[PDB]
Amino acid sequence: SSTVMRELYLIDKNGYVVAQTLPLPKSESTAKQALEYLVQGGPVSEILPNGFRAVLPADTTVNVDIKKDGTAIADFSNEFKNYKKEDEQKIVQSVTWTLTQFSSIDKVKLRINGHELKEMPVGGTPISDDLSRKDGINLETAGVNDLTATHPLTVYYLAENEDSEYYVPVTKRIDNSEKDDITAAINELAKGPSKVSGLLTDFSEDVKLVSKPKIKDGRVTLDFNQSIFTKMISSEVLNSIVLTLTEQPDVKSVSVKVNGKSELVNEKGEKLTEPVSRPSQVNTGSF
Q1: Which residues contact 219 (CB under 8 A, 6 or more apart)?
Q2: Angle 70-75-78 from CA coordinates, rounded to 5°
Q3: Is the dihedral of CA 3, 87, 138, 237 positive or negative?
Q4: Breaks in the chain follow which residues, C to N over 2.5 Å?
Q5: What CA–CA distance (Å, rounded) separates 245 from 167?
């Protein structure tokens, strides 16, 4: 009533940048307000869920200028510099993903006291002129990654703490020989996250698509084998699918079938015959 539910990209106890959807006071400058609620020791302290921490250094202030081309310019005070090197990429991703939740913002530029950032101050992490969700989040960097032979794709895995389950986006490397990123996403969901990553998958490893996905007017149709599930598909599996696929360009909804038929039911026993769209609140927080 006096608040609006807003995505804040906080840092969880294992180091992941993660959306927590939290009640923020009505405001005339919502993009600016969202960033203000990333500031350590600021108003977010009162609504900070357990197992998460704020992102920007204490006493950081910010202006946000939203251009007509969809670019938001976030101009920070000098306290912005007062972070640990280890958090450098987290901060860029947090700000980027927090700003781009708004339909008027799809690109981000960073400034400190009006000075344009081509790199982050503490550790020199490069920032591109075009900064968006496509620059990834929680990048998988374990092992040898051939960036010439792979492309980034964001996939949501499951985490949990005392209070709740929540969905954590991770940018994986997909082989460039895969031209179907819908299928790639599903295969990655079935494979599950890295071992000892603080993440889990509710997918069986045997899950496969049995038909090529179709897409029509932003609606993806998936046809699974029996491993996907009375024929119940779990909420964790369904949410993961939908969050993951609706990160992809032009995907607005997902319909699910098993071996040709719309026979899947959810945990409430409801038949899933219609397209499921992205949750209105991603990772509602508990405080």
Answers
A1: 252, 253, 254, 255, 275
A2: 160
A3: negative
A4: 229
A5: 13
Q: What are phi and psi of 62, to 5 degrees?
A: -155, 145
β partners of residue 193 = none
- Specify the experimental method: X-ray
Adjacent-strand bridge partners of 119: 126
Pairing of strands 150-160, 165-175: antiparallel
Instruction: Calculate the alpha carbon distances from 45 to 7, 73, 130, 167 in Å.
Output: 15, 25, 31, 22
Q: Tokens for 97?
A: 């993903």
What resolution in Å is listed for this PDB structure? 2.1
DSSP code of residue 45: G
- Who's near 143: CB < 8 A, 6+ residues apart? none
CA distances from 211 to 15, 77, 191, 258 (A): 37, 52, 19, 10
Interatomic CA distance for residues 84 and 254, integer angstroms: 40
Smallest CA-to-CA distance from 22 within 40, 10, 14 is with: 10
Give the tokens for residue 36: 């203000």
Residue whose pair of structure tokens reads 């509602």 in the numeric block = 284
Residues 6+ apart with CB under 8 A from 244: 154, 155, 156, 185, 189
β-strand pairing of 219-224 with 253-258: parallel
Is beta strand 150-160 parallel, antiparallel or unpaired with respect to 219-224?
unpaired
Any idea what the Cα angle at residue 92 is, between residues 65 and 44, rounded to 5°?
75
